[PDB]
Design a protein around this motif. Sequence first.
Motif, short mmCIF file in Angstrom:
data_model
loop_
_atom_site.label_atom_id
_atom_site.label_comp_id
_atom_site.label_asym_id
_atom_site.label_seq_id
_atom_site.Cartn_x
_atom_site.Cartn_y
_atom_site.Cartn_z
N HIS A 167 -47.25 -6.35 -10.52
CA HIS A 167 -47.13 -5.20 -11.57
C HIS A 167 -48.49 -5.11 -12.29
O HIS A 167 -49.36 -5.68 -12.46
N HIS A 168 -48.57 -3.69 -12.87
CA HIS A 168 -49.56 -3.72 -13.94
C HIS A 168 -48.98 -3.89 -15.16
O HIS A 168 -49.94 -4.68 -16.12
N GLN A 169 -47.77 -3.79 -15.58
CA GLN A 169 -47.17 -4.07 -16.65
C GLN A 169 -45.59 -4.27 -16.40
O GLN A 169 -45.13 -3.32 -15.78
N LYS A 170 -45.07 -5.33 -17.15
CA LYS A 170 -43.53 -5.53 -17.04
C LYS A 170 -43.03 -5.83 -18.39
O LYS A 170 -43.54 -6.49 -19.26
N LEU A 171 -41.67 -5.60 -18.69
CA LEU A 171 -41.01 -5.82 -19.95
C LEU A 171 -39.49 -6.42 -19.69
O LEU A 171 -38.98 -5.58 -18.79
N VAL A 172 -39.31 -7.55 -20.19
CA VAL A 172 -38.02 -7.92 -20.03
C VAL A 172 -37.38 -8.28 -21.45
O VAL A 172 -38.25 -9.06 -22.27
N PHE A 173 -36.37 -7.76 -22.09
CA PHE A 173 -35.97 -8.01 -23.34
C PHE A 173 -34.44 -8.25 -23.43
O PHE A 173 -33.63 -7.42 -22.97
N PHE A 174 -33.90 -9.38 -24.13
CA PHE A 174 -32.52 -9.60 -24.11
C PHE A 174 -32.34 -9.67 -25.68
O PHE A 174 -33.08 -10.09 -26.56
N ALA A 175 -30.95 -8.88 -26.02
CA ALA A 175 -30.67 -8.92 -27.32
C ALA A 175 -29.08 -8.82 -27.37
O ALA A 175 -28.25 -7.95 -27.02
N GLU A 176 -28.54 -9.89 -28.19
CA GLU A 176 -27.21 -9.85 -28.60
C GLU A 176 -26.78 -9.54 -29.94
O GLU A 176 -25.60 -8.97 -30.07
N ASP A 177 -27.63 -9.72 -30.81
CA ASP A 177 -27.39 -9.18 -32.11
C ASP A 177 -28.61 -9.04 -33.06
O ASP A 177 -29.27 -10.27 -33.05
N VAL A 178 -29.08 -7.79 -33.32
CA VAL A 178 -30.37 -7.63 -34.01
C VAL A 178 -29.99 -6.54 -35.11
O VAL A 178 -29.34 -5.25 -34.84
N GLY A 179 -29.94 -7.04 -36.44
CA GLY A 179 -29.47 -6.04 -37.52
C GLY A 179 -28.02 -5.94 -37.36
O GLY A 179 -27.47 -4.69 -37.57
N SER A 180 -27.37 -6.83 -37.16
CA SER A 180 -25.94 -6.75 -36.80
C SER A 180 -25.10 -7.71 -37.93
O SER A 180 -25.50 -8.51 -38.50
N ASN A 181 -23.79 -6.97 -38.15
CA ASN A 181 -22.87 -7.45 -39.16
C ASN A 181 -21.59 -7.78 -38.57
O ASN A 181 -20.47 -8.01 -38.95
N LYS A 182 -21.74 -8.20 -37.22
CA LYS A 182 -20.27 -8.21 -36.13
C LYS A 182 -19.39 -9.44 -36.74
O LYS A 182 -19.82 -10.47 -37.12
N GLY A 183 -18.23 -8.91 -36.98
CA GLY A 183 -17.20 -9.85 -37.30
C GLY A 183 -17.16 -10.31 -38.81
O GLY A 183 -16.52 -11.21 -39.35
N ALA A 184 -18.07 -9.70 -39.66
CA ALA A 184 -18.28 -10.16 -40.90
C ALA A 184 -17.20 -9.57 -42.02
O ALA A 184 -16.44 -8.57 -41.62
N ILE A 185 -17.20 -10.14 -43.03
CA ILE A 185 -16.16 -9.84 -44.09
C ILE A 185 -17.02 -9.70 -45.46
O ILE A 185 -17.36 -10.64 -45.83
N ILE A 186 -16.97 -8.47 -46.01
CA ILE A 186 -17.71 -8.07 -46.99
C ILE A 186 -16.93 -7.25 -48.07
O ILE A 186 -16.19 -6.19 -47.78
N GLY A 187 -17.16 -7.93 -49.30
CA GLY A 187 -16.22 -7.25 -50.55
C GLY A 187 -14.61 -7.16 -50.16
O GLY A 187 -14.00 -6.35 -50.75
N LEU A 188 -14.06 -8.25 -49.30
CA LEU A 188 -12.65 -8.17 -49.49
C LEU A 188 -12.07 -8.69 -50.79
O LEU A 188 -12.60 -9.36 -51.59
N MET A 189 -10.78 -8.05 -50.85
CA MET A 189 -9.97 -8.63 -52.15
C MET A 189 -8.56 -8.48 -51.97
O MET A 189 -8.16 -7.57 -50.87
N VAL A 190 -7.73 -9.29 -52.37
CA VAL A 190 -6.36 -9.65 -52.26
C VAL A 190 -5.83 -9.79 -53.70
O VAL A 190 -6.24 -10.50 -54.34
N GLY A 191 -4.39 -9.14 -53.72
CA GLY A 191 -3.64 -9.38 -55.16
C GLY A 191 -3.03 -10.63 -55.36
O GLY A 191 -2.72 -11.18 -56.34
N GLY A 192 -2.57 -11.43 -54.08
CA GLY A 192 -1.75 -12.45 -54.32
C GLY A 192 -1.27 -13.30 -52.78
O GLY A 192 -1.59 -12.53 -51.88
#
Lengths: 38, 38, 38, 38, 38, 38, 38, 38, 38, 38
Positions: free
Chosen positions: I13-38
């Motif tokens: 090649h003159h130039q080649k690029l390989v890039f793998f990404a599973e989570d970048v800037g992600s909040n997958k499956g996160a729980i934020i600001g949850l609340m419950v009464g009882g």
Amino acid sequence: DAEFRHDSGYEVHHQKLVFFAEDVGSNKGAIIGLMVGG
Amino acid sequence: DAEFRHDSGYEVHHQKLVFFAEDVGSNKGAIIGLMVGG
Amino acid sequence: DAEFRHDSGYEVHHQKLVFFAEDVGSNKGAIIGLMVGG
Amino acid sequence: DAEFRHDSGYEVHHQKLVFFAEDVGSNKGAIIGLMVGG
Amino acid sequence: DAEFRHDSGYEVHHQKLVFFAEDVGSNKGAIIGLMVGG
Amino acid sequence: DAEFRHDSGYEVHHQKLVFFAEDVGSNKGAIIGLMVGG
Amino acid sequence: DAEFRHDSGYEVHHQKLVFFAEDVGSNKGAIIGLMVGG
Amino acid sequence: DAEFRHDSGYEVHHQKLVFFAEDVGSNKGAIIGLMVGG
Amino acid sequence: DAEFRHDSGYEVHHQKLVFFAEDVGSNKGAIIGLMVGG
Amino acid sequence: DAEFRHDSGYEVHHQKLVFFAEDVGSNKGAIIGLMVGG
């Protein structure tokens, strides 16, 4: 890089939640894997 | 790099939560793996 | 990078929620895998 | 990068919710996998 | 990158909701997989 | 908690970079500010 | 928590970059600010 | 939590880039600001 | 949480690029600001 | 959470690009600002 404040007056609750977050799991402004030829 | 404050007046709860976070698991402004040719 | 404030007057609730977030799981302004020839 | 404010007057509720978000799961302005020949 | 405000006068509700969002699950202005020959 | 390896054969470069990272600025699996009633 | 490997055969470049990252600025699986009544 | 591999055969380039990322600026599976009444 | 592989045969090649990404800037499956009464 | 593979046979290019992405700037399956009365 700034002031946090939380002042309470007369208040009544069964439950209350206050949460401040500026950077959690962040890479803001970061440089990773940079390269230069000259 | 700034003042934290939390002052309480008359308040009643079953449960309450206060949480401040400026950097948790962060690499803000970091330089990692940088390189330069000259 | 700015001031957070939350001041309470006379208030009554069964439950209340306050949440501030500027960067959570973010890569704002980041540089990743950059390359240059010269 | 700006001021957050929430000030309470006389208010009554069964439940209330306030939520501010500027970047959550974001890559704003990020550079990923860039390449240049020279 | 701008000021958030929410100030309360005399108000009564059974339930109320306030939600601000500038970027949630966004890649605004991002550069991904760019390439150049020279 | 696993083996790192990097073995070189005949290779020629102007510059090369190898970087391994398992945890940098991380709180993986951490418990912070937990509480229980009984 | 797994093996990293990078073995080189005959290879020639002007510049090359290899970068592995499993957790950088991450809070994976973390528990922050949890609370329970009983 | 899995094996990384990169093995090279006869290859020639002006420049090449390999980048692996499983979690960068992530809060996957995290629990933040949770609350329970009982 | 799975194996990454990249094995090279005869390639030019003159130039080649390989890039793998599973989570970048992600909040997958996160729980934020949850609340419950009882 | 699955295997990534890229194996090369005899191939010739001026430039080539391979890019895998499962979550970039995502909040898949996340719970944000949830509330319950009891």
